[PDB]
Amino acid sequence: EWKKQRKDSHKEVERRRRENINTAINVLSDLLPV
DNA sequence: ATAAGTCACATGGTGCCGAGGCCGCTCAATTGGTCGTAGACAGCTCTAGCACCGCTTAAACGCACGTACGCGCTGTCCCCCGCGTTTTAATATTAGTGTATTTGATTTCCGAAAGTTAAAA
Numbered sequence: 001e002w003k004k005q006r007k008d009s010h011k012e013v014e015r016r017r018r019e020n021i022n023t024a025i026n027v028l029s030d031l032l033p034v
Numbered sequence: 035a036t037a038a039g040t041c042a043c044a045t046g047g048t049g050c051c052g053a054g055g056c057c058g059c060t061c062a063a064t065t066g067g068t069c070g071t072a073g074a075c076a077g078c079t080c081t082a083g084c085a086c087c088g089c090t091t092a093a094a095c096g097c098a099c100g101t102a103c104g105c106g107c108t109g110t111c112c113c114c115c116g117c118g119t120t121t122t123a124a125t126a127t128t129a130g131t132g133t134a135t136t137t138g139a140t141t142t143c144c145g146a147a148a149g150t151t152a153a154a155a
Contacts, residue, residue, distance in 0.1 A: 006037085013039060 009037080010039085013037095014041090017040065
């Protein structure tokens, strides 16, 4: 049924968001003096 | 309108910190069990006892009594000490050295034990 697929896709996009935040934090951290 | 998307919310869970709760290792001497032998015993016979008379006269106890002997006696000699005093040496403190003991690791020592037999009234 389609509703579980909707939930799975929503979960996937949420995970992508969560990963993007960490990637941005890491690349920002790599530039700092310390 | 709705698939994508951001977002916060809500719950997940993973990690580290005590901590009170079980647990692990060891040695005391108990008691469990088991060999083998001191122990009490099993017919026993005869020892030196200990009466059990049955004498004798050698001790012995009293009968007498006697110097010896005692026991306080008594002038007096003496000596011990109660102090008083100077001494006087006994405190009782530190001390490090100089063996004195000393407790590990053997490491020989040697006689109790197991044959084997010498000797033994």
